[PDB]
Amino acid sequence: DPELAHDMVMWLAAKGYLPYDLERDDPELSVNIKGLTFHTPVGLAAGFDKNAEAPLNFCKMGFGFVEVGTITPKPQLGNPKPRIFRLAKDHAIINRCGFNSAGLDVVEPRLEKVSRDRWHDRLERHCVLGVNIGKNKDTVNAEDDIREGVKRVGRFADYLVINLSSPNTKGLRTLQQRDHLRSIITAAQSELEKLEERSRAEQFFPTQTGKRPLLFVKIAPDLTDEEKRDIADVALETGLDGLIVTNTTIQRPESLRSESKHETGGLSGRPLKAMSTKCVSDMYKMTNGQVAIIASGGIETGLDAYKRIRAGASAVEVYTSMIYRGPIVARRVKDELLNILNQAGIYNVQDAIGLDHRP
Ligand SMILES: Cc1cc2nc3c(=O)[nH]c(=O)nc-3n(C[C@H](O)[C@H](O)[C@H](O)COP(=O)(O)O)c2cc1C
Ligand SMILES: O=C(O)c1cc(=O)[nH]c(=O)[nH]1
Numbered sequence: 001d002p003e004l005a006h007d008m009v010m011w012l013a014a015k016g017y018l019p020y021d022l023e024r025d026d027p028e029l030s031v032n033i034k035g036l037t038f039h040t041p042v043g044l045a046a047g048f049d050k051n052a053e054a055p056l057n058f059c060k061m062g063f064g065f066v067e068v069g070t071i072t073p074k075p076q077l078g079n080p081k082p083r084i085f086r087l088a089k090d091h092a093i094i095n096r097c098g099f100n101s102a103g104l105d106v107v108e109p110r111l112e113k114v115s116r117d118r119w120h121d122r123l124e125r126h127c128v129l130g131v132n133i134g135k136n137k138d139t140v141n142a143e144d145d146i147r148e149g150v151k152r153v154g155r156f157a158d159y160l161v162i163n164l165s166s167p168n169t170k171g172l173r174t175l176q177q178r179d180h181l182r183s184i185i186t187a188a189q190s191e192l193e194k195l196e197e198r199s200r201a202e203q204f205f206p207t208q209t210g211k212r213p214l215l216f217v218k219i220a221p222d223l224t225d226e227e228k229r230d231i232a233d234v235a236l237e238t239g240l241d242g243l244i245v246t247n248t249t250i251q252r253p254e255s256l257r258s259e260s261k262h263e264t265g266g267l268s269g270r271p272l273k274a275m276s277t278k279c280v281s282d283m284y285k286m287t288n289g290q291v292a293i294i295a296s297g298g299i300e301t302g303l304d305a306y307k308r309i310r311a312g313a314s315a316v317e318v319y320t321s322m323i324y325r326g327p328i329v330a331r332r333v334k335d336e337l338l339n340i341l342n343q344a345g346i347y348n349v350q351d352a353i354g355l356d357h358r359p
Pocket of ligand 2: 047070095096097098099100163165166167168169247248266267
C-alpha cells in the first residue's frame with residue numbers, strides 16, 4: 001500500500017533512522033540556478049514531506065533539495081481514504097489528497113526551526129529548501145491565500161512554489177489563464193516585496209543568500225499549446241523566476257494495466273514521463289531558457305533525468321520513483337546521471353542544460 005509506505009518512510013525520516021548519504025557528491029552535479037546553488041539536481045517532489053516534518057533528513061539522505069508539501073493557510077483534512085493507489089503494473093500512482101495540510105500556523109515555526117538549525121551541526125553543504133503553497137479547497141478569492149503563504153512561510157524559502165495544478169482541489173487547475181496567472185504571480189511578488197530590517201545565515205531571513213526566494217509556479221502537464229504559449233508569454237513579462245514544470249496528470253492513457261487505472265485522481269509515475277518531458281521542452285524553448293525550470297513526473301533513473309535535464313530542466317523532483325525504488329532513488333539517480341555525463345562528453349550538469357535546443 002502506498003499510503004503507509006508514504007507515511008512510515010516519512011516517520012522513519014522524521015526520527016531519522018533511514019540510511020544517510022556519505023561520498024559528498026562530486027562537483028559535476030553543482031547547479032547554479034538563478035542564484036540558488038543546488039548541490040544535487042535530484043530532489044524530493046512537492047508531496048512527500050507535506051507538513052515540513054523532516055526536510056533536512058531526506059536532504060542528508062542524498063537529495064540536493066526537498067520541497068515541503070503544499071502548505072495551505074488553514075488546516076485541511078482533504079478527502080476520505082482510500083485516497084491514493086499504487087498502479088504497480090506500470091509504475092504509477094493515482095492520488096486524490098485534495099490538499100491536506102496542517103496550516104501556516106503549524107508549519108511557520110516548523111520552518112523557523114529548520115531555518116535556524118540547518119546552519120549548525122555537520123556544517124552543511126546546504127541542501128536547498130523549496131516551500132510549496134496553496135489554497136483551502138473552497139477559498140473565495142485565491143489571490144488572498146497565495147498572499148499569506150508568502151507573508152508567512154516565504155521568507156524561510158530557498159524557492160517558493162505557487163501550486164496551481166493539483167487536479168484534486170476545487171477548480172484550482174483553472175487559475176493558469178493569462179489574466180489569473182498574471183494576477184497571482186504579481187500579488188505574490190508584491191508580497192516578496194515585503195523586505196524589512198535587522199539590527200536597525202542563521203539569524204535574519206535566512207536562505208543561502210540574503211533573502212527573497214526565487215519564485216516559482218507549478219503547472220499541470222494537461223495544458224494546451226494555445227495556453228502553454230500564454231503561460232510563457234506571461235512568465236517572461238511578469239519576470240517569474242521559474243516554472244516547476246509538472247504536476248500530476250488527469251489523463252488515463254490506453255496501454256495501462258493495474259486494475260485501479262480508472263480512479264479519480266492525479267496520475268503520477270512512468271506514463272507521466274513522455275507527457276512531462278515534452279512539456280519541459282516547450283517551456284525552456286518558448287522562453288529562451290530565460291525562465292528557470294524544475295521538472296517532475298516519471299523520473300526514476302539517471303537516464304530519465306539526464307534525458308530531461310538536457311531538455312531544459314536544471315533540476316529533477318521525485319516521488320513515485322521514491323515509492324518503488326525506495327529512498328536510495330536519490331543516490332542511484334545521481335550515480336547513473338554522472339556516468340551519462342562522461343559517456344556523452346560534456347561532464348557536469350550545468351553544461352547539459354538546454355542541449356536539445358543549443359545553438
Ligand atoms: C501522493 C502524492 C501527493 C502529492 N502531493 C502534492 C502536493 O501537495 N503539491 C504538489 O505541488 N504536488 C504534489 N504531488 C505531485 C508530485 O509532487 C509530482 O509532481 C508528481 O507525482 C509527478 O512526479 P513523479 O511522478 O516523478 O513522482 C503529489 C504526488 C503524489 C503521488
Ligand atoms: O491534493 C492532492 O491530492 C494533490 C496535489 C498535488 O499537487 N498533486 C497531486 O497529485 N495531488
